[PDB]
Design an enzyme around this catalytic site. Sequence first.
Site, PDB file in Angstrom:
ATOM      1  N   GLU A  35      26.575  -1.327 -11.923  1.00  0.00           N
ATOM      2  CA  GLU A  35      25.217  -0.798 -12.046  1.00  0.00           C
ATOM      3  C   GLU A  35      24.780  -0.126 -10.749  1.00  0.00           C
ATOM      4  O   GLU A  35      24.240   0.943 -10.776  1.00  0.00           O
ATOM      5  CB  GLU A  35      24.223  -1.878 -12.520  1.00  0.00           C
ATOM      6  N   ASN A  46      16.180   8.114 -15.245  1.00  0.00           N
ATOM      7  CA  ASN A  46      16.566   8.366 -16.661  1.00  0.00           C
ATOM      8  C   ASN A  46      15.909   9.616 -17.216  1.00  0.00           C
ATOM      9  O   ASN A  46      14.974  10.148 -16.629  1.00  0.00           O
ATOM     10  CB  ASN A  46      16.209   7.188 -17.565  1.00  0.00           C
ATOM     11  N   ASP A  48      14.036  10.058 -19.947  1.00  0.00           N
ATOM     12  CA  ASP A  48      12.657   9.890 -20.328  1.00  0.00           C
ATOM     13  C   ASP A  48      11.702   9.849 -19.138  1.00  0.00           C
ATOM     14  O   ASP A  48      10.493   9.685 -19.328  1.00  0.00           O
ATOM     15  CB  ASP A  48      12.450   8.662 -21.229  1.00  0.00           C
ATOM     16  N   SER A  50      11.719   7.580 -16.752  1.00  0.00           N
ATOM     17  CA  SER A  50      11.671   6.243 -16.207  1.00  0.00           C
ATOM     18  C   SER A  50      12.804   6.104 -15.160  1.00  0.00           C
ATOM     19  O   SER A  50      13.727   6.923 -15.129  1.00  0.00           O
ATOM     20  CB  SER A  50      11.725   5.206 -17.325  1.00  0.00           C
ATOM     21  N   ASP A  52      15.512   3.438 -12.803  1.00  0.00           N
ATOM     22  CA  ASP A  52      16.233   2.161 -12.689  1.00  0.00           C
ATOM     23  C   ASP A  52      16.333   1.705 -11.220  1.00  0.00           C
ATOM     24  O   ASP A  52      16.552   2.514 -10.339  1.00  0.00           O
ATOM     25  CB  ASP A  52      17.616   2.326 -13.269  1.00  0.00           C
ATOM     26  N   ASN A  59      14.796  -1.258 -15.410  1.00  0.00           N
ATOM     27  CA  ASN A  59      14.111  -0.076 -15.887  1.00  0.00           C
ATOM     28  C   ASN A  59      12.575  -0.186 -15.800  1.00  0.00           C
ATOM     29  O   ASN A  59      11.985  -1.191 -16.237  1.00  0.00           O
ATOM     30  CB  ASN A  59      14.522   0.121 -17.342  1.00  0.00           C
ATOM     31  N   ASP A 101      15.528 -11.968 -23.825  1.00  0.00           N
ATOM     32  CA  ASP A 101      14.702 -11.332 -24.817  1.00  0.00           C
ATOM     33  C   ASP A 101      15.360 -11.091 -26.166  1.00  0.00           C
ATOM     34  O   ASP A 101      14.800 -10.435 -27.009  1.00  0.00           O
ATOM     35  CB  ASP A 101      14.013 -10.084 -24.260  1.00  0.00           C
TER      36      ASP A 101
END
EC number: 3.2.1.17
Length: 129
Positions: A35, A46, A48, A50, A52, A59, A101
């Site tokens: 990562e 990213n 969109d 957003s 990281d 995110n 989650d």
Amino acid sequence: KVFGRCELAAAMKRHGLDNYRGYSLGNWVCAAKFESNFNTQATNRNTDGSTDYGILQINSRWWCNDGRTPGSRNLCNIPCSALLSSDITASVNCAKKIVSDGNGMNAWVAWRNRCKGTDVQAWIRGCRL
Ligand SMILES: [Cl-]
Ligand code: NA
């Protein structure tokens, strides 16, 4: 800070990620490897819009506030900048929340693509733990 493999494994173990939600330590070290390359300061934007953040590339769409992702949620309730610290505590606590989650470590695309169903124990091979 750029962790070594064994140093990070040790820091993650102490922070309670060893077997967190069934995920042995090699998994967590493997994800961090691909990562962020063990760099707490890693960031990636990213499509969109957003971003990281940190060692586990968490995110801003969902997990932190960076003040520039309109419409995003702040599910770990921290500024995203806190995920870049050389102290992995904030990143580790937010990770624990993500992995719970329902989707497990499939949240981390590099894990799913590069770690899932590989020999992950190899990432903690030879570390004094
Ligand atoms: Cl799971
Ligand atoms: Na956010």
